Copies of this chain bind each other. A is one copy, B any other.
């Protein structure tokens, strides 16, 4: 009867001279038009009020505006938050007319009941099952006999955490609203992994390129390697990751040109080529002081910083200045019914227009993140053309983190000072941009547009994560990234694998109740743990696929 995060609302109209219409709009909508929930009729006779059944969304909040089809006057505005499976009864009576809320069945309290208790129980059960399976393997072997520079590992732990979170939220994340990507604006747990992947990509770009150059290899061989790696990423993404082959053979008239791997390849090429051309040897003798307050890692890359600033200015100018036909200039909203629905075919503004012009409507993402909340009827691709500038900026921030990590290697206090300084600077910039509020600010945090505040917020998060991880996993040694670094070293293999093997049995099976959050959560956690186990097994076999 009811679906996930969907309370059942019954409207009892005790009125006898009005045809009430209940409207609806979530709290998380910024400026959304009210959608008709159900059209309750008037009571034919006194004593027996007219009733109708409506299913209200539970994910986050609910605004119910009561209007009558005759005069269109707000008899009462009710603003509540519903539960996952709740028999809610709304009665409105003339006393003038006030609508009161009654609960006939208590909600399941989605994400309230599971909390950390169910997660700990599931983890214990999975660990016990794995240990029992491992012990059973030795039982068969016994019965048969009876019968007859190195890797940082902190960047690796960072990438492993990002990969685990990405595998969890890509498989559904328990079908929870906050483990999915945000509709248009703000941040969720699924909006963090991709920026961290670009950050780590830039960091590893600098680490690998400087290792290769100081190992005595020509810059042209590295240029060829970079070009081949970016081309392979783009082709792999376009041919394998982007299209859903369960719907039929791939036709060029509906091929999704831009994607996650295409974005990664393009920004890899751009920022890696920037580093290659403007490559200076890593200074070593300069690290002779104690906690040196030198800006060497920044002033040694003034041309790349100038190019990055020019690119960021280009992104800001195109976003806020490019005149989109039939659209306000500098439009950042979601379109659809968002922003009071006055721009329905304007999902993404300048970035969406650039994508639709250069690549066409059919070569974009047909199911954007905003399509489920703001009801966008057009196609917008989060990995568009305009957002690649901000992805390049993020990759260069990762490059800066790598320069911090390598220029000062012996002085771990210097590394921590630089990480804290950069995290604070980027956090202050993000707070200034987004104005702390989710939907307010000059450039609100947005994954779909890859907003500048999105880049800065996620880069500050990445700098803080590196600040926490580098001493613990490298200097102090209190933790080896025990379950995380195997995905860190098999990132590309795990990404291609889980984007290819989404529907295979160990990662996805038929569920007893498809509308249960706990069943989906168990399936997604088991699938993520199995991908970690696969990465660990390949680590033991020393099978590291690299492009």
| Chain A residues near B (Cβ < 8 Å) | 141, 144-145, 148, 220, 223-224, 239-240, 243, 245-246, 248-251, 500, 503-506, 508-511
Contact = CB atoms under 8 A, between A and B. Distances in A.
The interface centre, meaning the residue of A246, A505, A508 with most chain B CB atoms within 10 A of its CB, is A505
Given A145-B220, A249-B511, 6 more contacts: A245-B246, A245-B504, A246-B503, A250-B509, A250-B510, A251-B510
Contacts of A220: 144-145, 148
B243 A505 contact: yes
A117 to B, nearest CB: 27
Which 9 pairs between the two chains have the least Cβ-Cβ distance? A251-B510, A246-B246, A245-B503, A250-B505, A249-B510, A249-B508, A239-B505, A249-B509, A250-B509
Contacts of A504: 239-240, 245, 250
Given A245-B503, A503-B246, A224 B508 contact: no
The interface centre, meaning the residue of A239, A245, A249, A500 with most chain B CB atoms within 10 A of its CB, is A249
A141 B231 CA distance: 14
Nearest to A248: B510
A87 B114 CA distance: 66
The interface centre, meaning the residue of A144, A224, A239, A510 with most chain B CB atoms within 10 A of its CB, is A510
19 contacts: A141-B224, A144-B220, A144-B223, A144-B224, A148-B220, A239-B504, A243-B505, A245-B246, A245-B503, A248-B510, A249-B508, A249-B509, A249-B510, A249-B511, A250-B505, A250-B508, A250-B509, A250-B510, A251-B510
A145 B245 CA distance: 40
Contacts of A224: 141, 144
Nearest to A247: B246
Contacts of A506: 239
A216 to B, nearest CB: 18
Contacts of A248: 503, 510
